[PDB]
Symmetry: none
């Protein structure tokens, strides 16, 4: 019952079943009629949609999940290498924007979790800076999808897929990706794993559970869960729900002195609908359901202050960006070792169909914190032989993020061919002095003295997979002895514990 | 206001009135304290007690606190250079053992806090080591009082006094000392400040708060709070309290297959009593009150597993050691940046007076963790002129250990006379490679490879005082901007930031 995990089981094989035991599972009883026809594949099956001119779908495609139904409620979902929704075809056609900017390649206007550390983010524009300087790297946005471009980077660093699993009985695809600081070269590490569950629950409804796992040392306090939006030319009409289940046209459009619509979710009916136009209840539509409850009492230990939505067509009707942004935002603390989740729904149908399904399902949204127990967590064995006998035994790792345990990753130096395992995602990663963009007289000047940037995106190191978690404490009991992983290492070039991880990690003793 | 702190204000002056704001001030619901019955002095006033034959009380004396009362409740407390109680005279005469062993000079059988890192401590004797090897330095015990001797060291390194303060309205003497690894030459740094408050609360009761401030990188998980005990020839009768308030003679004596009495504190009534004999309720006595509550649920985040006492006469009635050990032991984690305290009481009177007073006061014992806030913390100015203009401005430091802030120490090279300030207590300290005492095939061999010992006791450097704390983060607001201390240094021989402290310490910018 401790299965072997081969280190070269690629996450793309979608076999990592035990790595998702901690994702909440929703039982609908007889509320929803399940799907009788769902396909899933990782074979390359491109959308045929129109994209920004430099883009090639082979660079982003990961998987395709399709709900095969009637003409109104069929939907066709394509997941990218960052675990993001980069293409989503419904009765209105392609609903994901084209990614018209050459430097933003399916990493911004795509459906994805995003998280911000407000204490560290700096959104200063370039006219706050000294002459000739730029604001590169100052912002702290960890994108689920991946990075913007930078010099020498021709396509994005998509958030590396670290594990994945397709459950054919459940009709659910699970992905875990290491989220990427989007603004390159970043001043900051990412200590966020994004786990997302995509499930065909029937009736044209897609159930998506966004999990944000903070294994780093920063506090995230601004969550886009999700960030995304729609292709404006496919879905030009914008509607918000109201308490009681009616819908109202909304008009928010970004421009001078206008950031669009913004309201707390308890001012809504739990959802928005984008439709081909605003003229007909039969117009093809996409609904996004985020619920209508802000449970400030229950989450007061995490300072949940509000949950709100934004909606805005970006610019005018001919903007080549062809993007209407939408986001659900949670203002809540996700501290180191916290794991937050939020379950939302995407619905495909006519506007009338979507409104009825959204009124029915919005009560089923939930969010909260996940704390897996050891007793409910599987283990896997990593074979010493596959690590070139770098240990004096095989080792066992947990496959759920029990509070405080430390993820262990398989990485490869692409120039030397050396493969190794480490908790340290930044071991041997290129860093460089940061060019302080501020004048000496700026209040912000001292913040950016003696800083470095991290170049983990530059291809020298490839991130292969998550192998499991090592306990941060001695779990010795009457059944099993534990010892420090340090005591087992024969070849510290293959099992790499850098200074901050010395004498901290425990595994069963053979 | 931000007062000046002269770098020539010796801690021995007992004037450091703002360095103790973080010590819990106990407010009593029923106890009434007198205000005309306490003396304090740092004038050399020796005890006249009999000590080990090589000892000179001038080498240990720091200060004297005396409670003026009747013949039963008068007590006379002498604090040593390490902040320890080295002499404690009551109705039974001298209560502290003589320190009969030449290598243990008021550093063991004295009342003191002691802390152990179980992760690092190794108590192996020479029998476990290779032929010619020694176990010197393998143990990890940070004594409040000071070090044992070693070849080349004629009197101890007493834990350097960093700050002290007598408040004549409160009748309380506060010391802060830098605890010493007692087993020399040590493999380990000390990252512990011990702050102890000695407060006369009247009628023979002395209130003592032991504060353990972990500013290092180890985890302490075995705390003697206190370690100490009594002079057996003065206090030969040993009693433990029981739930309900009665007392019982105990018999624990060290010897073959016997380490004395050991019980969880909730098996007691909250105290022990040592008395001149066991024959009469009028016998002169010393009570030590440690409480009877083990709050495992409340402290579950700190892994409080047990609190227990030990008591043992060391050897037979004619042992020249003339020592009955006593200690309260807390098994709890004090992690890096934690500050733990435990308040206990010493009571001087007849046995029956001590029992009555202890039954009443045992409910006032408490322990916990301290997290000082900026709002409750004072600041001081260190004058650039006093540092030979080594900076380009005067600097301000905090006088409480707000979590994460870095203490700054004044130190002196005894060869050159040069004084300097640094957070690095081991700057310029002589180190020597550690001879691995284990055979190559021992499971402990790798642990002791590539190790050094620290000779901070060798007289090269003298530790003068704690000047305050620098913030570990930028505290800039609308009024005062903060800068890196690095930016202010003109003479890096007088203000010393070594590699691990570069670009980390923030102070107000002038």
């Amino acid at each position: 019952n401790i299965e072997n995990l081969s280190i070269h089981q690629s996450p793309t094989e979608a076999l990592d079943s035990t790595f998702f035991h901690h994702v909440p599972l929703k039982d609908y009883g007889n509320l929803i009629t399940p799907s009788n026809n769902t396909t899933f594949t990782t074979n390359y099956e491109p959308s045929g949609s129109s994209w920004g001119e430099v883009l090639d779908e082979q660079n982003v495609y990961l998987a395709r999940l399709k709900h095969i139904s009637n003409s109104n409620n069929t939907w066709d979902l394509r997941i990218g290498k960052g675990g993001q929704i980069y293409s989503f075809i419904g009765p209105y056609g392609e609903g994901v924007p084209p990614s018209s900017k050459s430097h933003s390649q399916w990493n911004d206007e795509v459906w994805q979790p995003v998280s911000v550390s407000g204490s560290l983010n700096n959104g200063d524009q370039n006219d706050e800076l000294k002459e000739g300087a730029t604001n590169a790297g100052l912002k702290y946005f960890i994108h689920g999808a991946g990075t913007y471009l930078t010099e020498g980077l021709d396509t994005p660093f998509y958030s590396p897929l670290m594990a994945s699993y397709y459950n054919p009985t459940e009709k659910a695809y699970y992905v875990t990706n290491w989220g990427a600081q989007a603004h390159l070269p970043s001043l900051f590490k990412s200590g966020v794993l994004y786990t997302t569950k995509y499930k065909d629950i029937g009736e044209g409804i897609l159930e998506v559970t966004y999990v944000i796992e903070n294994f780093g040392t920063d506090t995230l306090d601004h969550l886009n869960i999700p960030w995304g939006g729609v292709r404006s030319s496919s879905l030009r009409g914008k509607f918000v729900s109201r308490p009681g289940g009616d819908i109202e046209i909304i008009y928010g459009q970004t421009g001078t002195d206008n950031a669009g619509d913004l309201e707390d979710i308890d001012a809504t009916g739990g959802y928005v609908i984008y439709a081909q136009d605003t003229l007909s209840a039969s117009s093809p539509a996409l609904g996004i359901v985020f619920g209508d409850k802000i449970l400030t009492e229950e989450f007061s230990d995490h300072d949940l202050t509000r949950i709100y939505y934004r909606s805005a067509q970006v610019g005018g009707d001919t903007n080549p960006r062809d993007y209407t942004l939408f986001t659900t935002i949670a203002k809540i603390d996700v501290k180191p070792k916290d794991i937050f989740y939020y379950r939302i729904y995407y619905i495909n149908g006519t506007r009338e169909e979507v409104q009825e399904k959204a009124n029915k399902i919005k009560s089923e949204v939930a969010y909260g914190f996940i704390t897996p127990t050891i007793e409910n967590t599987s283990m896997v064995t990593i074979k010493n032989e596959e690590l070139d006998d770098a240990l004096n035994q095989d080792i066992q790792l947990f496959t759920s993020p029990v509070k405080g345990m430390v993820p262990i990753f398989l990485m490869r130096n692409t120039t030397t061919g050396k493969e190794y395992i480490s908790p340290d995602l930044y071991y041997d990663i290129d860093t460089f002095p940061f060019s302080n963009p501020y004048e000496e007289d700026s209040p912000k000047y001292e913040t950016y003295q003696n800083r470095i940037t991290y170049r983990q995106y530059n291809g020298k190191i490839e991130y292969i997979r998550l192998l499991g978690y090592a306990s941060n404490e001695d779990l010795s009991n009457e059944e099993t002895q534990y010892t420090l992983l340090d005591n087992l290492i024969v070849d510290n070039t293959k099992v790499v514990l850098t200074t901050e991880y010395l004498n901290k990690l425990w595994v069963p003793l053979y």
